Structure formats: C-alpha cells, structure tokens
Amino acid sequence: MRLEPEIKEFRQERKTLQLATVDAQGRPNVSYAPFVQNQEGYFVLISHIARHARNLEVNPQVSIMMIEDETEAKQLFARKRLTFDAVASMVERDSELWCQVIAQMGERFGEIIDGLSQLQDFMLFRLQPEQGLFVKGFGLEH
Amino acid sequence: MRLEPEIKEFRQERKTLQLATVDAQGRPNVSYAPFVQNQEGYFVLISHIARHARNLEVNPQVSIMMIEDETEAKQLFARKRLTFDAVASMVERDSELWCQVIAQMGERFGEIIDGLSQLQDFMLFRLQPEQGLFVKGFGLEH
C-alpha cells in the first residue's frame, strides 16, 4: 500500500492514543485514552481522578503515540506507529467545541459517552501537534 | 480467574512496555520497548539514536505500563493494564548482568537479539520499581 492511504487507514482504525504526560515538577506518567480527531486537533475525554488529567491541567505538554497491537505486529521490535508531541488545552464544558467533539466521540464509541460526558471529573482536552510527526512501518516500510 | 494467576498470565503473555520518559528540561516522550523481567528488575534494549534512550540516560525516571491490546479489550475505556513508576540505570556492556540479560532476551525474542546486542547504538537499561504498582482489570474486577 502507498504511504498516504496506509496512514489514513491506520488513523481511522486505531481508537486509542498512548500518552506521556508530566506533573508540575516534570515527573513522567504513561497512560492511554480513546480519542477522536478533527480539524481542531485530537481529543481525549479523561478523568481528573487519574494522573494524566491532573498533569495536562498543570503542565500542558504531552507526547502522543498511536500504535498497532502487540498481537498484530509482524515485528515486535518494529511496531507500526505514529508519534508526535502536542500542547494540551481543556475544552470548556457545553461550549460549541465541546458539543461537537462529544458528538463525534459518541458516534465513534457509542452509548458509553453518554454517561462519561455527564460526570464532573471527566474533562475534555484538545491536543494540538507542534514539533512534527514520526511515522514508522508504513508504505515502503511495510 | 483469581487475581494472582491472572496477573501471572498477563506478565507472561505481554511482551512490551509502554514508556513515558523525560529529557533534561522535563519534556515528555512516549515510546515502547520489548522487555524481560527477572529478580534484578525490568530490562529493555533500546537505541541511543531514539529519544527515550537519551532521556533515560540524562533523567532516569520513567513511568511504565503493560497493557492489553486494543482489538482484544472488552471495554476500550477500561483496558486491562499494570502501571508503575521506576528508576532507570544503564547496564555496562559485556558486564555480567549484560550477558545474563541478553541471554534471557534472546530466549524470549529469538535471533533478532543477536543482531541488536551487537549494534553500538543499542543500550541495555535496568528499570526498578520504587513506588508500588497499579493493577487495573484483574481478579474480582474482571
């Protein structure tokens, strides 16, 4: 497959981001979150109870990775993946952006989003890429 | 399944760690690496060319996650997973621990290890847990 269409198929199939966040003193945390993406950036809906949400609140930098499953990988030392760093911003509840992304998320993930989007500790973060994109295992590399 | 056997099964079946590292100014990076574990800690063999290896060298804190695959998860918003923070240290090439761990890795991962263990950019890091372990999706929770 050609590079560009393979990237597209991958972004459409993968439902989760792996995230590296940091607290105010720069202690690292790794976590994951289901996501949707659109013209405004990548969006995750996560719990303030968990560290990654409290981290993105105080220190709005994230390293993001979208990666194929261990069991799907031809080569474990070369998992097909897309990686990029981003700047995090919280999305105001019930704002126009909020309603759009929640809608999108419901469409991708279904009923579950109904409950989650009601809970006060669940915050919506917009993540916007800034320093490039790394792509491994696509096109000529597949 | 009971908690303890379910954890045992997971660590045996899961072959990579997802890593959150930080550079000298505390900027996050997300990555992954095949691992082995033994009584000396968790071990990953990674390239100094890549950011995570240079991060671990200069700022040796890391957040580690072992996580079930996306396509296998019953619920995407509750992927079964183990998470822990750790301290990293570099293992001296051709030292006793190096030879011990390379043999273990070759056993888990096969001949690929023969090549990587000979590339000078590939370094062996020991990751040791310092602040307990978070267990999500096991035993009574399953």
- DSSP three-state, residue A25: coil
Given a contact cutoff of 8 angstroms between Cβ atoms, the answer to whether A133 and A83 are in contact is: yes
Given a contact cutoff of 8 angstroms between Cβ atoms, the answer to whether B54 and B29 are in contact is: no
The backbone region for A10, taken as left when phi is positive above 0, alpha when psi lies in -120 to 50, beta otherwise, is: alpha
Long-range CB pairs of B114-120 (<8 Å, 24+ gap) are B116/A77, B116/B45, B117/B45, B119/B47
Q: Which chain B positions have a beta carbon within 8 Å of A16's beta carbon? A: 70, 76, 79
Q: Among B132, B30, B128, which residue's Cα sits nearest to residue A66?
A: B30
The backbone region for A114, taken as left when phi is positive above 0, alpha when psi lies in -120 to 50, beta otherwise, is: alpha
Q: DSSP alpha helices (H): ranges in B1-142? A: 3-13, 51-58, 96-109, 112-116
Q: How far is A4 from chain B (nearest CA, A)?
A: 23
Given a contact cutoff of 8 angstroms between Cβ atoms, the answer to whether B124 and B93 are in contact is: yes
What is the rounded CA–CA span in Å between residue B108 and residue B28? 29
- Looking only at the bridges linking them, the beta strands covering A61-67 and A81-91 are antiparallel
Total structural domains within chain B: 1
For residue A140, the enclosing domain spans 1-142
Q: What is the CATH number of the domain that holds B120?
A: 2.30.110.10
- Looking only at the bridges linking them, the beta strands covering A134-136 and A81-91 are antiparallel
What is the rounded CA–CA span in Å between residue A23 and residue A14? 27
Residue A16 and residue B76: Cβ atoms within 8 Å?
A: yes
Q: Scanning every residue of chain A, which has its alpha carbon at the shortest distance from the alpha carbon of B65?
A: A30
Pull the structure tokens for residue A29: 């945390």
Instruction: Compute φ and ψ for B114, nearest 5 degrees.
Output: -60, -40
